[PDB]
Amino acid sequence: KLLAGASNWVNQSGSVAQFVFTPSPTQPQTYEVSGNYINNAQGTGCKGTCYPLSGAYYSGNQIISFSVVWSNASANCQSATGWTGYFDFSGSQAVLKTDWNLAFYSGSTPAIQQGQDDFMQSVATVSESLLTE
Amino acid sequence: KLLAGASNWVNQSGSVAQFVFTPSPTQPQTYEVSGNYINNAQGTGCKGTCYPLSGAYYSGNQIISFSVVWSNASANCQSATGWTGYFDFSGSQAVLKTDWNLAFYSGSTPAIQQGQDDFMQSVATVSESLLTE
Amino acid sequence: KLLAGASNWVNQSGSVAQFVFTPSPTQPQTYEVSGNYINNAQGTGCKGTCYPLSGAYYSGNQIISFSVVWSNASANCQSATGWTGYFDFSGSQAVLKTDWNLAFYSGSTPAIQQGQDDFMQSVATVSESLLTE
Amino acid sequence: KLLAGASNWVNQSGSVAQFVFTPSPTQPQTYEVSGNYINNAQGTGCKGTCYPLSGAYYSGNQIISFSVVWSNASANCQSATGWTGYFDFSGSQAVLKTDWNLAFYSGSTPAIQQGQDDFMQSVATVSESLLTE
Amino acid sequence: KLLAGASNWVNQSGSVAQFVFTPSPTQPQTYEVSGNYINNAQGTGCKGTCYPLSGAYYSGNQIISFSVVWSNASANCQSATGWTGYFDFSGSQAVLKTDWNLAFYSGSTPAIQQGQDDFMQSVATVSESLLTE
Amino acid sequence: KLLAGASNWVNQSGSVAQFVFTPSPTQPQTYEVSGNYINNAQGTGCKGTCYPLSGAYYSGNQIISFSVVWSNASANCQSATGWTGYFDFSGSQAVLKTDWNLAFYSGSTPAIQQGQDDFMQSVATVSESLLTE
Amino acid sequence: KLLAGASNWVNQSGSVAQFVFTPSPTQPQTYEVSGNYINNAQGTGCKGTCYPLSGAYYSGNQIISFSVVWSNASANCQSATGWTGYFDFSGSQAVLKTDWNLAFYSGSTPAIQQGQDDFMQSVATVSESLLTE
Amino acid sequence: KLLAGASNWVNQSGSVAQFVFTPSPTQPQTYEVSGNYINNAQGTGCKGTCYPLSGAYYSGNQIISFSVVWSNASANCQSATGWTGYFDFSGSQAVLKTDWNLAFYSGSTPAIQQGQDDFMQSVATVSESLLTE
């Protein structure tokens, strides 16, 4: 059911989605998705820093769709990605599977690449201190 | 360039995107996308009523990604569409070329169909009154 | 009694009122009315898209008055409807009996037609998906 | 055109509408109406005290529609009125003309009376002090 | 103890205070006072219409102090009053007693009159309708 | 005339009023008064720490009324001061002439002492650092 | 454990920290710190008036870091203090052990002195009135 | 002077501060600091993800102080750091120098380490796309 408050989701490239969910006033079992995305995928720019994500989550059947514009104070890749997929909380690990699309330019030549990402839940590690453990 | 205020975008199958753009407080040349989608395609669920849309827009090269959860007070199709794309405002007509992904079900069998919607800007039709024209 | 969350109300001519109720901070048993109206009557302007509605509701005896300005990103009929009425939730069906007034034009000749819409509550139709049903 | 900020409007029964106008984010040349209404009509209850009003104003052709639920901390008349009409700023005086409807109960017997009100603009009188002039 | 939500308070001149109380974040057993004041005192201007009041209420020993600037969309008396006094909820009636001060000008000649007002609680009268009872 | 931003006002007994002014949304030439009061009088409770102040100001003739509830995280004197007055910004010095009322206790014996504070504007003293001067 | 509402903390030199804690929307067991600091040390600038404080608090082991910019409507020392530390609520007394850094000037010669303040919680002193005690 | 909107600041360990500045209502030439901090310092935990920072910036002499509680959805190090230091925009590069303190526990044994960080401004790199340049 619920992963409410802040949740930490890590995909196959090291990439981190942190989701925040706020109930929608008009749309039943629908949450506004907010939070941050850290890109760590080897080929790409806009890696290692917080990009706000926006989208919508349908609780009923644990579906989601969210977007990142690859522009923040550290780096701009002049492009946008949208992720659309589903959750599966069953068992010892919780998994999100998504199909993604990415709008960009090569010349004055606009283009939409595409692909697929798989995120797994990982709960905050705890350390004695910043310095140790 | 500029769509400040609400703008009306109509796809090949007649479905309607109404966009509102709000500046991101932190993301250079990025706007939070809100507004409403009215799905008007022949063989489809959840048609002829407003679905909220949420996403993001990059004004640098006029790229967008938005999402709709198909649940409102009229009809629940327990599914999500994500659209990712770009706009060309050159010439007599402004067009939004999009690709899109749609996370839905059959049984216990999650799915994700792909597609392409192309939209054209259409400025409010004006009438003497609600009864004329 | 209670319509907490968004509710769907359909009139004789098929037009759709989606209501949201927020408690007044100061008015006993009064709610601020928001939501969306989709005008679906044969011989009319400004049909098949969401118009915002604003008004007020008295929960003591389940009375309402709301208004729509027929101007959105799709179509401007330069006019306003006001609806004033009451609800009966008794029995198998919940109905909203309304009278209404509509301020529009011809030439330089302001006008105000009268009328009566009657609405019935219809709870979200459910589908396996956006493609089925 | 503009009566922006707070405006004072007095009808034939002494009744006072104070309007506040805030531009709508989605609806072009449309304002959310807020403010207060003081009833001073001889036959009625809920006289002499502030009732919040809600509605919508279409600037284009200076049209309006607004609602009052006759419930506040001083008095409850368990009913609601909606006013729908037009402005005429021409000449030495500014005038609003409206058609109104009023939903109420007699027995378990719901009912909608009706009528018409005409409001004129009156700018704040100025006095040397509260005590004099 | 509590008169929370909206409360209706009537003094010896017919004058009406409606109070709204919101807990203070920093000041224990302290409420921000807001609401409306209707002046109906015979000698004065700024009579019969809503003036916002501002002040602070100390719950502990049911003490209060609030202010009205006699300027609104209907009338300006270019002056300000402050009321400071205490509650007594005991018995069949609830009473507020206050000492008031009023800052105004005669010539270029500034001046502070003074006086005392006594308010009694009066709960919303209820009527069959606006029209009757 | 103008005190936009925070201003510092010092009375004869050394107590400090720090004022912030916010335009009323509805009251011509009226500002909501916020800020902080530090009571510095010899023979008094609740001294040397910030008490919130709330009131209203009329910029037409530079008149004010504000209130302090003497309860904060340091000291509770279970009492309220109301100040009512006017400002003279003519000459080399800006002065705020005030009268005031103070609702406090003895036993089961509510009281309300009267008074007069006169304040002078004093613009931030500047230092090389927190350690110098 | 818990300091919900405003709390009063007094250091060895008599300076006063008034704390307010608000839950972070995203940071487990983290609170945004607001409130006011009154600097009461002998040989110092910017004393006896409220400086806003801002920082963060970790309730897991009751650790804090807050900052004051020494500029308000009374006195500008063009400098910043940062405090970093921990609380012990065991026993008859609650103490906040802190170290701190202070970024100030001489000429064109930026500096940063180090230090240690230790605070003790002191619950509001109560008085019959502002005049007694 | 100004680095207003979102700014990107990189220290000697790879660590990234993104600052957002909002003018303070009460404190002249003072900004509330907000934004995000990415830790990339070799010895430590809580590395590679967004931690909200809070503090205050004094424009006058370009001074700053801000805090991070090392707790977010990815990782908790149960500790807090405060940074206090100054800017120097002169020349071809803009530099921030800071003294930092860090509160943590070893056993039931609380402790405050300390150190110094130097951040340099780095403006958003621009890339043809996420995929290339």
From Swiss-Prot, chains A, B, C, D, E, F, G, H:
Q: Where found?
A: Secreted
Q: Which GO terms describe its molecular function?
A: biotin binding; protein homodimerization activity
Q: Name one GO cellular component term.
A: extracellular region
| Activity as a function of temperature | Is hyperthermostable. Displays a Tm value of 84.9 degrees Celsius, which increases to 96.2 degrees Celsius upon biotin binding.
Q: Where does biotin bind?
A: N11, S15, Y37, N39, G45, S79, T81, D117
**What domain of life?**
Bacteria
Cystine links in this protein are C46-C77
Q: Does the keyword Ligase apply?
A: no
Transmembrane portions of the chain: none
Domain Avidin-like residues, every copy: 1-124
- Summarize the biotechnology note: The specific properties of hoefavidin make it an attractive target for novel biotechnological applications, including drug delivery, nanotechnology, and molecular labeling.
Keyword field: Biotin, Disulfide bond, Secreted, Signal
User: What family is this protein classified in?
Assistant: Belongs to the avidin/streptavidin family.
Function field? The exact role played by hoefavidin in the host organism is still obscure. Forms a strong non-covalent complex with biotin and 2-iminobiotin.
- Which comment does the entry carry about domains? The C-terminal segment plays a key role in the formation and stabilization of the octameric configuration, since the short afifavidin (lacking the last 5 amino acids) is only dimeric.
What is the annotated quaternary arrangement, including any partners?
Exhibits a dynamic oligomeric assembly: the apo form exits as homooctamers, which dissociate into homodimers upon biotin binding. The X-ray structure of the intact hoefavidin reveals unique crystal packing generated by an octameric cylindrical structure wherein the C-terminal segments of each monomer are introduced into the entrance of the biotin-binding site of an adjacent non-canonical monomer.
What's the protein here called?
A: Hoefavidin
Placed within the complete protein, the shown segment runs 32 to 164 of 164
